[PDB]
Amino acid sequence: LGTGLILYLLSKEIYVITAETFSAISTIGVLVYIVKKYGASIGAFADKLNEQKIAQLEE
Amino acid sequence: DTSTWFITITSMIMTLFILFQLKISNYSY
Amino acid sequence: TPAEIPTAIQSLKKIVNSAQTGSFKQLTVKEALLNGLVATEVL
Amino acid sequence: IDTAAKFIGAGAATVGVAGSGAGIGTVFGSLIIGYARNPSLKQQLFSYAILGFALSEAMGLFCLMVAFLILF
Amino acid sequence: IDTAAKFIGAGAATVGVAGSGAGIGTVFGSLIIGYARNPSLKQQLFSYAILGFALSEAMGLFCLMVAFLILF
Amino acid sequence: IDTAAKFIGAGAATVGVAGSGAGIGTVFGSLIIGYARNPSLKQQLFSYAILGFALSEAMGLFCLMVAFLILF
Amino acid sequence: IDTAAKFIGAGAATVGVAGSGAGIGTVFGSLIIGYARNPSLKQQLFSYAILGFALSEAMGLFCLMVAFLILF
Amino acid sequence: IDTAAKFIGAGAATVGVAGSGAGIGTVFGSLIIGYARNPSLKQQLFSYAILGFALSEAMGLFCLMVAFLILF
Amino acid sequence: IDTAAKFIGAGAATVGVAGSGAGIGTVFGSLIIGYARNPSLKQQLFSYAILGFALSEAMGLFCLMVAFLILF
Amino acid sequence: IDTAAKFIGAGAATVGVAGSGAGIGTVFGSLIIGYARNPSLKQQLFSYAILGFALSEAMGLFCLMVAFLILF
Amino acid sequence: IDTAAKFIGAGAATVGVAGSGAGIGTVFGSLIIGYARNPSLKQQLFSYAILGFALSEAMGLFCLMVAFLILF
Amino acid sequence: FQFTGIKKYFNSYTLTGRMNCVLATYGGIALLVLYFKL
Amino acid sequence: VQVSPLIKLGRYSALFLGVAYGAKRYNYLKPRAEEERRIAA
Amino acid sequence: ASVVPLKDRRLLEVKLGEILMRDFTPSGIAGAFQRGYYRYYNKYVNVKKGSVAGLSMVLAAYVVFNYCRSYKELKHERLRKYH
Amino acid sequence: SFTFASPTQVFFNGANVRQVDVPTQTGAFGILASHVPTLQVLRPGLVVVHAEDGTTSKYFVSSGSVTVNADSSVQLLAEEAVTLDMLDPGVAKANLEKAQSELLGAADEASRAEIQIRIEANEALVKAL
Amino acid sequence: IAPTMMGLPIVTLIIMFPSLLFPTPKRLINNRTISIQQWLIQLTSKQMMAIHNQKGQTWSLMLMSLIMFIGSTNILGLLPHSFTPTTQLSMNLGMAIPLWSATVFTGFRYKTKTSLAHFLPQGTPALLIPMLVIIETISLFIQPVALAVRLTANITAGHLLIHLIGGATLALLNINTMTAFITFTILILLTILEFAVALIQAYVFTLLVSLYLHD
Structure with a gap:
């Protein structure tokens, strides 16, 4: 279905999706979120599991 | 664009305050 | 530029959804005959 | 005439953001002397510096919002 | 022509917030260095900083209120 | 046209309130940095800080009153 | 039109008092830090502060008189 | 007439970008003081000074972008 | 229309008085902290404080000379 | 009227020089206080002040260039 | 009307010298506190203070020269 | 039955928290003034 | 299964509807749009 | 009707961001959202860390709902299909 | 070149720690192997010595002198400098609260100032512990 | 030349979200x-x-x-297309006044005489x-409006700047280097726009300071 998603995106860009103020927040905000997830979120998962859980377990 | 009217925007926030405080009261350290 | 590319995949997804619904058995056998003819065309 | 007023009012209003620039410069400068006197950068020395930068940037953008309203 | 005058007056009145930005920047910058010198921030060392922010931002919001009154 | 000039003069006049904000921010930050050295906040230190804040705010509100008199 | 010129000039002229307010704030704050450093408050520490405050007020009053001359 | 308005706005707008010049001046001066206290250029002092100057110049360039919007 | 320009030009040039006030406030304030640091007040300390105040006032009066010239 | 607008815009744009003067004064003053603080003036201490001048006065000259371009 | 525009532009350009006054006041105040901290008087301290005063007042003089060029 | 979850907190802090009547009065007066403008 | 490749190929070959017919009709209307814009001016 | 929406919300919570809670805790540990970030039909979403698939789905749904709301105001550029 | 020693015990002699923080009477200061030469009076607090190596040391000290010359030689002299472990947090809180209770007992300005020194030392001890 | 629009859709669904x-x-x-939410709640x-x-x-x-x-x-x-409820002045006005009134009336409920004596x-x-x-009473009456505006104005201004620079990028069909530079500016601004959390901290901390001063 990857080709299906690509074709649906192409049709949306052709007809429905409007390229106005898209680079403002649709691209920039999503890119910032991607950088956050691929970056410090790996450490955030550790800060959740190996810190919050084990503390109350030890207690 | 500019904010006018000011009728129902300021009314739902009190209900959301009730919901948020009820939700966070369950949260505990 | 071919804007009809997504159409076939949309039809495939519609068929998949119809299969998921469970009432797809209620359809006529004409579609099966058409599918057989189209498959035989490649042969 | 009205469009001329819009342009001149926006050009005036955007000049008020200079004070916020001076404020952010002052606070970020004071950051460096605070760090020099006390090497505790990751602490409130930088935390409150970021807080002050955000506050002064707020004081500037909340000014230029008037210019944006004037232009439109 | 009065609408044009209101536009330009509101634009000019908006520039009176620059002093507010300079003041907030200066007070928070002195806050960081004061904490750096004396690690007793949780005290009046930060309470008076917050109070100074509250009492210094007043000029900027007053000027913007005047600008809004001129505009409307 | 006279009312137009009243509007523009009121808009330009309230700009003088900016200096009050910068002065108040400066005096409060100086209070912070002074208290950082001498723990005597409940003394003439806060008294003179309030004195300077009052003087600066009074100057700013005097300029605001001049602007209002121009407006009316 | 002449009265319009007087109004706009008076609005523009009175803004010079902002620098007087900033100087007053700086004077009082530096008095604060000076008293924080040394407790000789009743000495010329207060006298120099009064001297600075008076000169800043005199400059602001001269700007006010210029504004009055423009108005009248 | 609107071209005249654009000229006036561009004249007034660009001053706000220049007001940030004092901010980078304060940043560099505080850098002077910090390096005088604890001389280490490779330390976080230079990085903090660069960050403060960059933020002040970003405020200035954002005001200049507003000026360009006035022009266009 | 020139007589109309006289008042607005005089008001616009009066803004330079603010810088003189800020400068005199700063120099006098530094004299306070200087005397706080060193009790040799009546010396070249106060002499150079007077020098700086006089130079700032000279710059301010030189600025106001432009307003007095344009008004007449 | 186009020449009139260019004249008033260039005059307005020349206000940005004020920020350059304040920044240069601040950087040179901090150079003074750093030299008094430590005898390492001839080291990178003086170079930092040189760079601060070459940046703040560069912004001032940029504003002056904008004023010239508006004039011509 | 062109003479009126030149007059108002010269009045506007006169503001850019207030920052020169603020800068010279700040640099002279610095010289005061530096001499207070360091007995060194006629060394690079005073020479660099005079240099900073000259630079700031030269920038202000150039701004006033541009104002005169607009005037004439 | 979510009322009893924060019933104690409700009357615990609204003794002065439940002064939203002032907000309602201000909003109503502002709306009346704007309708007069309208 | 072989129905899907043939359907996809037919869809790909159907690009002429937006090119041989739709695009040419839009190009023909474009001169009319330019003439209307000129008449408006 | 609303009972069905509550059940759907509970099922979404269990699938992503999930005593008897031990079964729910193991279900969250397995992370069915982590396996397929773009549901079983597709492979995964662009973000590939933090087990944030469910939050990403919720944010994407909110974004598309707001886009549907805002489509009324915005207008296209060309009647012909874009490049 | 760090010279840290009590009148009875020696901590560091000519050590190239290159980073020392001292609880000065006026406030806090940080040595960076190039700090401006100065004389600093110690205040009730803790000296967190940061060696050139990643390891650091924490010693709570009494009043004294921080003598950093033009060179890197710093002669830190603390009257009663001990590690935090030797102290008692419970006794720390007890002494702090007792000193706060007795602060008003000393009618004399000098004696009340002395008890203020006591409460300040106990507060620094509590923060360190 | 695109008019900015902070439109008013059916608010309740967006606000409750x-x-x-x-x-x-x-x-x-x-x-x-x-768990991370709980840890953040405890830390704050x-x-x-x-x-x-x-x-x-x-x-x-309740302040949490x-x-x-x-x-x-x-x-x-x-x-991308989220509508900030706090963009509208209505709800922030309806939040600032009741809480400031609560603080002042709590101050006037207990040790009322000294609460008014805080002016001295x-x-x-x-x-x-x-x-x-x-001056101080005018500042106290200013405080609610100040608290509301210092949130509304910059929350709106962040979106306004994002819209302006995004429209500049979209309209910039010129040299692609300038477009890339402006897009970099956009991403830098949006990273700065993530500091709206600091605005939450400032608002709540000012409210806490007011409440502590009056109680």
């Missing part, structure tokens, strides 16, 4: 996604309760909900006492 983003499980061990609650240290700490259990709500509403606005800064010059009193 951030609440659903925080689940509250009734388990000893949370779901490693509410310690900071907020440090200053009070009074019987007014009961207010902290307040800060969580404002942060969630403002952080969600960074999405322990003496101060008597020659300027009326001026100081009128």
